[PDB]
Design a protein around this ligand. Sequence first.
Ligand SMILES: Nc1ncnc2c1ncn2[C@@H]1O[C@H](COP(=O)(O)OP(=O)(O)OP(=O)(O)O)[C@@H](O)[C@H]1O
Ligand SMILES: Nc1ncnc2c1ncn2[C@@H]1O[C@H](COP(=O)(O)OP(=O)(O)OP(=O)(O)O)[C@@H](O)[C@H]1O
Lengths: 838, 838
Amino acid sequence: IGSAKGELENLLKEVQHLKGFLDDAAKLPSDSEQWKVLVEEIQKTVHTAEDAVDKFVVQAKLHKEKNKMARILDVGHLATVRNLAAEVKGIHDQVKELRLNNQALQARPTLELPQQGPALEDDEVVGFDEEANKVINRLVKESKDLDIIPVVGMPGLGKTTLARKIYKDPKLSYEFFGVHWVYVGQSYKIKDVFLNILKFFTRRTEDYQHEDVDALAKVIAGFINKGGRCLICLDDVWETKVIDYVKTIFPENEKGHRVMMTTRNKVLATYANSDPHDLKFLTPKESFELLVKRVFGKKPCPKDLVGHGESIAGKCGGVPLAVVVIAGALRGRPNTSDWIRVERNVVQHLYTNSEESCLKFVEMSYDHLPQEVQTCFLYCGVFPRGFDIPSWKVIRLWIAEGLIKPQESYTLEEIAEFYLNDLVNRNLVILQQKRSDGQIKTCRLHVMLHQFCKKEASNKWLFQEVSLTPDQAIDPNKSRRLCIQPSNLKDFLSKKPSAEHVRSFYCFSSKEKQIRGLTPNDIKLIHKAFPLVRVLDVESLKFLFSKDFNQLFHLRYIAISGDFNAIPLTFGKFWNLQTLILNTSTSESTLDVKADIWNMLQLRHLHTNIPAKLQPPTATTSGKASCLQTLCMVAPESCEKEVLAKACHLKKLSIRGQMAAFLGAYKGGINNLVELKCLEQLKLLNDVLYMNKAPHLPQTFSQLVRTVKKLTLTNTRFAWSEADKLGQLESLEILKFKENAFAGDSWKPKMGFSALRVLWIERAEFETWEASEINFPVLRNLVLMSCDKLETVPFELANLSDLYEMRLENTSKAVKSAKAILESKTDKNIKFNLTIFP
Amino acid sequence: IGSAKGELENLLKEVQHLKGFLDDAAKLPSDSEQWKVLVEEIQKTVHTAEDAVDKFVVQAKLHKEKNKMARILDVGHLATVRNLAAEVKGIHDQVKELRLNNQALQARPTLELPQQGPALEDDEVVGFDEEANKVINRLVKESKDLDIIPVVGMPGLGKTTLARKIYKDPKLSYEFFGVHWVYVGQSYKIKDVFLNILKFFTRRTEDYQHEDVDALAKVIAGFINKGGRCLICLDDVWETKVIDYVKTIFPENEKGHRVMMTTRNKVLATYANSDPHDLKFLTPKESFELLVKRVFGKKPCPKDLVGHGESIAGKCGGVPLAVVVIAGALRGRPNTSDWIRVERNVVQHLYTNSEESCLKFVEMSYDHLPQEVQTCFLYCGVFPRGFDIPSWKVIRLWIAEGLIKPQESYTLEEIAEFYLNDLVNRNLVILQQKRSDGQIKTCRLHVMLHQFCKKEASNKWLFQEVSLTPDQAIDPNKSRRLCIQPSNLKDFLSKKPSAEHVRSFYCFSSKEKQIRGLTPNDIKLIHKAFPLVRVLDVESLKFLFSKDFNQLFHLRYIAISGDFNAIPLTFGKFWNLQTLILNTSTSESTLDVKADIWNMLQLRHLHTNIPAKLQPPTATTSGKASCLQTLCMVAPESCEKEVLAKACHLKKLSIRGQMAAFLGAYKGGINNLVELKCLEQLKLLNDVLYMNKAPHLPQTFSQLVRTVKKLTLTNTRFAWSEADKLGQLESLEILKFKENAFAGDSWKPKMGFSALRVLWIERAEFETWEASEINFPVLRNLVLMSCDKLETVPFELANLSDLYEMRLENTSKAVKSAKAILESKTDKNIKFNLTIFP
Ligand SMILES: Nc1ncnc2c1ncn2[C@@H]1O[C@H](COP(=O)(O)OP(=O)(O)OP(=O)(O)O)[C@@H](O)[C@H]1O
Ligand SMILES: Nc1ncnc2c1ncn2[C@@H]1O[C@H](COP(=O)(O)OP(=O)(O)OP(=O)(O)O)[C@@H](O)[C@H]1O
């Protein structure tokens, strides 16, 4: 190739300038339509330049793949390269014209250039009676030390309303000499906060205005000492510095002073109190009651509007702020037509209107985010509203979208995990599913937060939901990525879509396993529509590997399903592929990975729903260690010395098959596991129910997986004496036995698991269990489920200090022993939780 | 050459404009991403232009080296010159476009466009009880005159916390009538400071607000006279003018008033008090205790977090500010995963987050630096974290990097020594090693300061640490220089690096002498990767002189190791070379310097680990005096009349070999030392243990090295009577005798060393020593080591006025005499220190 490399480089520099401008404009608040048009044009120009460069790189790589004879004799390559160079030159001319003509594209040194409601009467507050009672009981408990009870929750959940309800409660007056309210806020000055606190004790604050912060703290402490027990309410705390400053205004008189603070941050609340108070969500009934109180005040709802109102209140997610905004939409419109209109799209009516109260309140928390976490938050709105987002899937989508910039000491997966946990801690992501590690398993976006992400991503052109009003298309040409539900897929494809600029295609099955009437021609049309697609995350389909699919060389993420007997060699030409998630309905016991994954240097995660029969690297493929981090459902046959050596950086590994033929001496494929350097999770599964002999844990197993933190055994059918071998694992932290992993009437462990935190037993047909303290010194969780034959969980566990959680699911008489242990620990007054189902 | 010289000159002028802009932008705070992109582009353009000019200059020099026939017949030179001219023209066009298109590159006349914590209860302070007691004992000592006790230390070390602890101490209340606290600060007005001081004595400061500074000083003096003994605490003093102003507010009533000031500057503290109080660093235990107090307040650390917390606290360097910042990172996160994440990289978690408290506090001291000292400070971050930086090496790296601009009266080495000492005096560099001269031998960067330098250098593109996350490379293309540890060298080279823009390559062996598995091909790859490298500081290797190494004509600094029997002539073509540090493992006794160093006009320092057998300059090489400043390990054979004449400006000289054949009459190579005009240091070493005869100091020796300040004799085996000849040296300031330098049972010196300051004896097998006062009139240090046979250090030295330091290392009974002298001087109450090991 000639000068086109220099043209590419110059275009990249200019596009870097344009992207810097776009990042800057994302900060600038704009009310000008011409500014909006210019930013749209620059975004489109950046996208076009990126697509052109990517096409050029792909063509150069494909040419270099071809042999020298084919390289010379391919005139079609010459025509394509000339066309791509012409396109690059045109885009570069456009970018230069953009920068030259517009004075807004001039760089500037430092120049980006950027009250509560009426007052609720105690009957205007809905559903907070029990919550207020709980917080009041916590506040009025006698204790010598200062105690902070933080009320924490998502924006507009009612933290300030509950704090005001408690602050006005008569009960507090009997217990506390002084009950003061202080508003801190995000932007606050501690001198002002202390002066406001001082007003509650002296009316001569015009005398103390000249004092310093510490002097004012001492003055307030003396006043409180003169008074007695005091409760100071801090509103809207966004830093720990406030908590630390306020600790200094309370005298050490052992009276039991209190602070009730409200915050959106769970980490700040956990600093304030190891047990922060999570404000509840209103029930649908309470939501409807609040809606009726907001719309009709004290008058009852008209009968004809009750059904619509109940529908509307249930669509607000139980967050009072949403109900208040929707009420503002329904105020003074007792007509059924207006209520039907609002019911049709309630989340839209949040963030619209001047009373868009959701927008500014959500933006309070949003602006507090770092840029990477900000962008990662928006891509949570790529899932359907109400979708139970898998944490692993969203993490891998963030990484595949380039949202996570690599850091020196952390893997991209670790950074993404931290970002997701930070979003949950800031109460911007709802988490209802916990892994045994204590990490997020599935998360969710609240309807109001989801609508915020959906609008913000559309404003920033990150992605866009394909929504059709009977016919028509809504500008799909104004979106880098497209999300479409399976119901709307057929209609969209019937238009014969052709969007080169679209880079990610999302089809999420919220109604799981509702594969609609999509034909192979529709899948081929999907392939045709997006040739530059980087992320293809569509698992509700019967995907087929057409010849057009083999040309999606830009892919970084694929989540597909169908009837695949093997991964074709064509997958090996996706040199950008990072995540490969497969779900094959084929009856074949294992999936043949024909693709030479080892030469896919970018590949990090491979997920298959049946065991994968990998191929050992050839002598040519030898080189550096592979980037692979996850290898799920790998057949024991494929765990060879070379396979494991190339993937020595593997972190999660799952094996399923004939384990017996894997734990033997000449079966040292198990011994090949030593090649791994950072193996954290290991799943060992057995498929056969009839066993020639009961397998055995090799004596080498202790140091074969010494780095493993999570170990899962399934259908292994091991003698309970074989569990003693797992105690020699130094890093074993979470341990799972499921589906008759260990066989035997009783388990009498002797070895102690030095670091085990979570013990997990499922469907264990054992009868008795005589563990002791030495066996699990640092146990923290004990999850037994489907243990219909277990007799009694040993009392010896009751003496374990760190143990504070234990769940018995579908458990026999052993439940009674769990009650006995709970009773003993309650007698000792140790924080403990015991869950029983049903 | 044709017009290309004019093109070079015009490109140089435009690059001067761009560099001026870069210097300006370094001052401008910027939040615009487009601004960052533009600055990056201009930096890359400046680097590219510099590289092009350098390539052109070296090519012109190489052509001029060739003979006229070769010059005319070298078509390859014509092609290379045409390519270089085309590159220069392209870079000039790019620079012109940069200046024309961007309105931020317009020159403007003058237009660059630029609270404490809560409060600690004395139980929240860790490890300062003894320090506070020491400072209080110093304060409450009875003395007639005003006494200032400065608490000095590095940023965030806790000077203000200890000052507050002392200010709150009850003990001070008994001793002092008034104990006031004044905050001065970097930006301060003396009128405001005096008015604040006045408030402590009168509540009518609204009456005195109109007085002048001297009038207010007199008023405060009268108030203090009325009161009694007073202690005024000055916080954050950055100038001596504050000290002088505050001296005027204390009446001369002989009561013993005190001032306790805190500062980061050791020179300011030494002005305030000849014995300033150096605040301690927290021990790892105290650091963990402080971390637990900051994270969990008064509750104990959870057991599962104690190991992670202890690891984290030990990575904070004993500076409380670092522990406070890391606590802010760990607050409200009692999960082992968060603590593991923070432990993985603790120094990163300083300077990140809004509570980046390290950043602003370090910037306070950094901005106080001059630009040259600022840049020299950052290049201390090229060394590994925790590396013991050699002073000579960092000085020579600063000079080789162009950081020191020559001054009229000072050599570059003197300016660099001053800069390093200034960085130590500002408490920005940690010094723990002192030369006998009292200068810094090795220094260190605190982990928090090191991270500041690392980040700041990366932000300014000065250098960059090559760090790989398993695979990958982090933008190496966005750095002028690259530092890589030997562990990461092999992985980096396997990528086949080719970085023309990289100008310095650093490989520092913090784990000393851990030469890993690097092959000759790796060394050749190092040579290939950086052809424009100016600085090559890599001594943990077996370097080999390949043909590619011979083409690094830009080299200004080389520090290499291997098996070299001689320096090839190819080193003579490094016309830019200043420092040549060699460590050759060859068994051959000396190093043959084949390269014609005398024509290497820029050469300043030559260091070899074995004696160097230089070659006398030829009649052609005659000319000006050589720039050589250091000639270490030069064989006595090479010290000839012409060799010594060409290097008359030499300052350090080291000789090792057969001294007897060097001190003789016909051996007047010793007499050739007269040719030196500024010889400061002389080392004379002996290699032979069997001597035909005991050598003799020539009677001419007194005026042979008359300019020498430091003299080192090793293995010479001289009669103790020969030490009397060294007393005639006018400038002899430091004298070292090591490894049986002088042989004899006893030493009875008669001559007196008029200017000797430091007397250093190592492994002297003499028995008795009967020195007297006249012998060492101005002695200041007497350091004896391995004197297992010395009987008693004479009491006569106890009467020496200037002597205040004496160290006996592995010393026999003579230790008892040292104790006697210490006792006598303590009786006289003279400041003295006596160190004994073990
Ligand atoms: N239980 C409730 N009953 C009635 N209105 C409520 C309730 N909880 C909240 N609100 C409404 O919320 C608004 C008051 O702020 P709110 O108490 O919701 O904020 P918060 O939870 O402290 O959140 P943030 O301060 O982060 O915005 C008013 O519209 C109030 O009517
Ligand atoms: N011994 C200590 N125990 C507890 N906290 C400490 C201790 N020393 C310092 N700190 C805390 O560390 C942080 C920095 O310390 P401090 O402000 O006293 O430092 P300083 O030496 O005066 O520095 P600067 O030059 O910035 O004024 C503050 O939060 C201080 O409270």
